[model samples]
Target chain A: HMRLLSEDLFKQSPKLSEQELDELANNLADYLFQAADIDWHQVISEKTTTEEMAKSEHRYVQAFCREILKYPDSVIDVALKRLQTGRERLFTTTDEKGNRELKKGDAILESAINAARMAISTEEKNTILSNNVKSATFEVFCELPCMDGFAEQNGKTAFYALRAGFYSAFKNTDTAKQDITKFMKDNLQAGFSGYSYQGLTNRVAQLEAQLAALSAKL
Target chain B: GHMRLLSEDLFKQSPKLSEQELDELANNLADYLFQAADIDWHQVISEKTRGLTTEEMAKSEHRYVQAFCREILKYPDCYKSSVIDVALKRLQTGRERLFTTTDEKGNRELKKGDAILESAINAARMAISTEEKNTILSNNVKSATFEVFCELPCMDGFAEQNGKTAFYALRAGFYSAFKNTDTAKQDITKFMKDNLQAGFSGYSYQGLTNRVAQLEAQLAALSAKL
Candidate 1:
């Protein structure tokens, strides 16, 4: 008892149909099942002793994971930027030292990923390690697939890709003089079992035009 | 372990607990636990530990040290010292009352206090992904908390040694603990609900407040959207 929705036009990405969103969410959820089963005592019984070097490492990872977990912030930021006024309000910070800012938000996610990788490196150095602690992720995510799509653009000029996607989206903003109705008509045939709903189709076209008018430029 | 569940719940109730309430709770709990170590400790200890030997007592001490390595020092990625300290206290008490609790908890379940703390530490470790936990300044906040030991000079009576840094970290961790509780409400609240224990149950305010906050956020967003 599920239904399908619509997404993407003028571009054809077979794997990214609107229907796939549900699958992505479901798969990621299944991956976190171990977390759901963990016993709190298994973790608690291990806590004892304290030291400075250990403290430094603990603090570093807590900070590291916190930053990494915020990976979605960059995505939300990008999506927000694409929708509203840009992230011009974002400014450089007073970090430990030189942390440069890249043009797109995806780079931030990439660095966060890098931070997590570094944490793994740190863990490899420890003599005794808990598999659970070693494996636990920093946050609960619902849309990592989308996040991954964004993250993939990390450093090799993400601004350009963003610029391209934005440009494509904008270029069709007021233009795209394609005879799509005619093209469909030209290709239409009664050979298939399905038939067209002329009435609904007309309403859909009108609604599409109205929607295009309502949306703001990205 | 039960303490973490209860504490996580109480901490989540922070918005309602008020600063004064929290201060009072901390003061009272600290007072009671510390005092238990002092005056009435012998009786409390005896009552808690109805049973056997000098050798068992020694085993308990050694276990505390071993637990530290297994749990706190054990973590590969992040060394959660404060977690270990708090974790250690649990072991020390267990050792203090090891023979008393009477294998009632059973040896099969016994790992060490630090090991027990690892669960909470794991929870905190994974907390970063919750989006709500990922604040711009979170990293700085963490570093600031950890810096008391790393950056500060090793003066006498200060952070004791490798193990002592946890003392400094604990001061920072108390806040980190609060933050962890806050983020848990937003991030894992929904996910944690399914695991609710029958009695003390799952992550406390992790459920109730999260539902409340979710509604509040939704209502505001709907209003804005409208």
Candidate 2:
């Protein structure tokens, strides 16, 4: 029904032939339509915890993932960007000044992501980070397949190759201590299909451990 | 040189900002560029639009107008859509697609609350493109009126942030006489119908239409196009 949108969009991406566009559109449509089946609150209830609930390292990823479960796939296209930006700022902003230099278990640091999420819910935060975390996450993980393609073309391992940039980008924010287990687990169950929780967790753990030792001064 | 990218990034990061905040940001950006660039709008327009075909000019100008609107349009209440219509119409000579609306409302000229809007329109009027300006212009002018809208920003907001700086770039070549010939009308009508069918549903007027109502207009517009 909305194929005309796809057709118009395809005009801009001329590299794809009609067949290729159709294939891509079908894949995207199925992906978007099917993702509504995901149970967001269940995933949130299962993954987030009252224990150290306020810790940035624990809370940021959890809040980010919980937010993703909150939106339909149709609208996730806009949600994911807000989520990613909010996630990236977990320890890299004006708010970070209040919570940075603290240990993983600090109540203050833990509340960083929660506080941000709360601000959104309370209508105090102006950013979409309030309600769009789920949509944002959904869109980002959906696009991971592109990273798979990029990795293959460059003769590197899939998604893990992005680990370095990811690490480099956020090491200052105590990204080394942040857990991605739930993030990966939820995506895998939501039909992201390309990644495994165990594999991504292991890769993240290994990379974070290495970065922790590097003790990135930033 | 890199300020455009910086502006785009700011837009991506600030999607949920209130109209006041966005207005402040746009004013500051415009101020910074005005002082730093020592911009000669006319010369810049000439260089950009030089030697382009008529179609190319319209395409270029449309992009400029659309970009400026896209950024600020997030807070539709911040500026009057009518100002945008006025600025655009005044700049372009005879491409009168929606002039009827202005007349129906009493053909008043530009007034207050539109310094920024007028500047943006002047920029587009100076240089430009035409194909699909109505859709792009109308879409952005009314983007923020949605009841339950996308609260998120894009990767760089280049997708929409172009709204501000794109105004400055001003597409050139809309100066030539425009012939809204039957062929162009048919093409635009079909294009609009296609856009409606394609899920390009949103605001009808700035803050005048909500989701279901917007979709209803889309269907009606599609019918009109057909």
Candidate 3:
């Protein structure tokens, strides 16, 4: 399946100028964004289900990982830079009270950051060797909004979807399998197991506030 | 849009410094100058500058140089006993702070810093002996030096002293010496001196301004061709 996608991408443009490649990547990202069908304008509220958010995130990652593999490394680099710049532009906005609020575009940017990061990690084989990557990926795994029963289930569902996408993309290569296996093995039991539920919740809120203050200054 | 392209091209053709680097360098230098006997801090800060002794002034200079080294070369800030002890404790605990998780197992393992330090040590030890190797490293060293010089604080003062470009050039040359163990210090010193004398003699504020104008004209011509 990955081979066919790669072939299709190559056939579409045997040779593309730098500008042409940039436009192609931009268009591809827009298509993926629409296909994900995320309500970018809606902030996560108490009514939002972890499953719903996880499903949308999973879809974006699965498609992104598979589709991004079609491009050559050069195009991937350009695409990554564009995505990063776009995300930076969408970071935050000042509210009427002069407080920094996460813009509605943040969800879109976060999704792009996640998808691009996952794709890059797989491409670089950093997933297998880099402990930084391992720890970060595990952190993401453990921090999934559904870390409780709901979070745990949705996190597992998202992880499996991501695994399936990569496995199919690499055609179940031994290296790819090892990367996924090692990744899962390392992160399997990692979590906020050492902390009380309320303590962890309070710590997360404090850290989030600190992060918002720092980002607002930027 | 055409003007932006022209301006961007001009910027690309000219020397550049990252804004953070420039800001930090200026702030550090200002701190140093405030304590220097040559700069009268009394005028800058009025009577608040009083009660600062010669010993304190010397310490300020020491702090400024150390801060500059930390910023530019990514050197660890200080070799003070207290700082070392704190770092040692952190290493032993394998925790960023006391309140953080005590397990320090699994993904929280403390191998990453060791790996980075090991790689950096090995890279430092790898000698650049050949002319080709020297050429590549020296070019990068010179480029880094030039960028710092582009935004050197109090450029006019240093230019008048005939020491502005040479100061950064020498530091960059010293850095190259660490990478290229075969090169003699005198040779590196002489090379940098000659390079600065020949190519960077006109590195004052006005000179930089004129150079930007020249680059703009050239970029305009190139854009017309395009």
Tell me the tens digit of each residue's lDDT in model 1 across A1-218. 12111122111222344444344333333333222222222222232122332344544334333442333333333433442332343323333556654334444444433453455432232222333322231122212232232222221122233233322422221221122112222212111001112222233455445444444321
Interface RMSD, Å, model 2: 23.8
TM-score of each: 0.16, 0.17, 0.15
Ranking by TM-score, best first? 2, 1, 3
Q: Write the per-residue lDDT of candidate 2 for residues B1-226, one digit (tens) a residue.
A: 1343243234334445555655454444333322222233333444545555434544554465344454324323342344334333343432331222122356633323344445544555443433333333333212211100122121232113222222122111111111243233333333323322322211111111233344445445554543
Best-fitting candidate, scored by DockQ? 2
Predictions ranked by lDDT, top down? 3, 2, 1
lDDT of 3 at B39: 18
Task: Calculate DockQ per candidate and list them.
Answer: 0.01, 0.02, 0.01
Evaluate fnat for each of the predicted models and list the values in order: 0.00, 0.00, 0.00
- Winner on lDDT between 1 and 2 is 2
**Model 3 Cα interface RMS deviation (Å):** 28.0
Candidate 3 residues lying further than 4 Å off, grouped into runs, are A1-12, A15-218, B1-226
Question: Which candidate order results from sorting by DockQ in descending order?
Answer: 2, 1, 3
**What is the per-residue lDDT of model 3 for residues B102-204, given as tens digits with 9 covering 90 to 100?**
2324333223333423332333223222333333344454343334333433232342332333345434554554345443333444443333332332322
Q: What is the clash count for each candidate, in the order shown?
A: 32, 27, 2
Candidate 3 structure lDDT = 0.34
Query: Model 3, residue A47: what's the lDDT?
Result: 16
Q: Which ten residues in a row have the lowest lDDT in candidate 2 chain A?
A: A121-130
Model 1 TM-score is: 0.16
* Weakest ten-residue segment in model 3 chain A by summed lDDT: A39-48
